Ligand binder design. Structure first.
Ligand SMILES: NS(=O)(=O)c1ccc(Cl)s1
Ligand SMILES: NS(=O)(=O)c1ccc(Cl)s1
Length: 209
């Protein structure tokens, strides 16, 4: 059972701007998704401060980066608060309509795409490097779901029958043919050291073969 949804017009406009605008500094996608993961980990930690059972689904709070050259995917895993089905449909838990509005007025006022994160819609910078994005998520109050979109105006949501997560969010980036540099160990390490050196959670870069 797979449900298909239309993006709100403003969000469709944002993703086409990200996909079509010439902008060479694509590496900021990773900073934005790691920062999103850190925000989600902050939220489950705060909730657990007054109710420890919120961590029965997983005590460890961390971020993993998993490149896979065979599948040409880069996956960002965190054990944060996760997302409900309603959250996924609701622009992945963001205020994306008002955020896109403020972002686009900022761009005509001197901004560039790199401050997308200041407007709450940093997730969509994933489409600087990915032709398709899959999001697997598990929230304590809901079941495990999978979100997917290749842009073009629509996204899908289905119950995920894959590997159980426990709690958190998995962003799978199906990389464009000319963006495979972000599967290289020394290139990921350079970006994490440049942009994410102060994230308050352990970031583990997996190796291959
Ligand atoms: N869409 S979002 O809520 O910024 C987000 C992307 C990845 C997460 Cl973990 S949370
Ligand atoms: N260690 S983990 O983040 O659960 C993971 C290992 C392999 C994946 Cl694919 S996801």
């Amino acid at each position: 059972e797979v449900e298909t949804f239309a993006f709100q017009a403003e969000i469709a406009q944002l993703m086409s701007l990200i996909i079509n605008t010439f902008y060479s500094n694509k590496e900021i996608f990773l900073r934005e998704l790691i920062s999103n993961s850190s925000d989600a980990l902050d939220k489950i930690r705060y909730e657990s401060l007054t109710d420890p059972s919120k961590l029965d689904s997983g005590k460890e709070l961390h971020i993993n980066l998993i490149p896979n050259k065979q599948d040409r995917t880069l996956t960002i895993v965190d054990t944060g608060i996760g997302m409900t089905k309603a959250d996924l449909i609701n622009n992945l838990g963001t205020i994306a309509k008002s955020g896109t509005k403020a972002f686009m007025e900022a761009l005509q006022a001197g901004a560039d795409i790199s401050m997308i994160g200041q407007f709450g819609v940093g997730f969509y910078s994933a489409y600087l490097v990915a032709e398709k994005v899959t999001v697997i998520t598990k929230h304590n109050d809901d079941e495990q779901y999978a979100w997917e979109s290749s842009a073009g105006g629509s996204f899908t949501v289905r119950t995920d029958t894959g590997e159980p997560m426990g709690r958190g969010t998995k962003v799978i980036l199906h990389l464009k043919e000319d963006q495979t540099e972000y599967l290289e160990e020394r290139r990921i390490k350079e970006i994490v050291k440049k942009h994410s050196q102060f994230i308050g959670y352990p970031i583990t870069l997996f190796v291959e073969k």
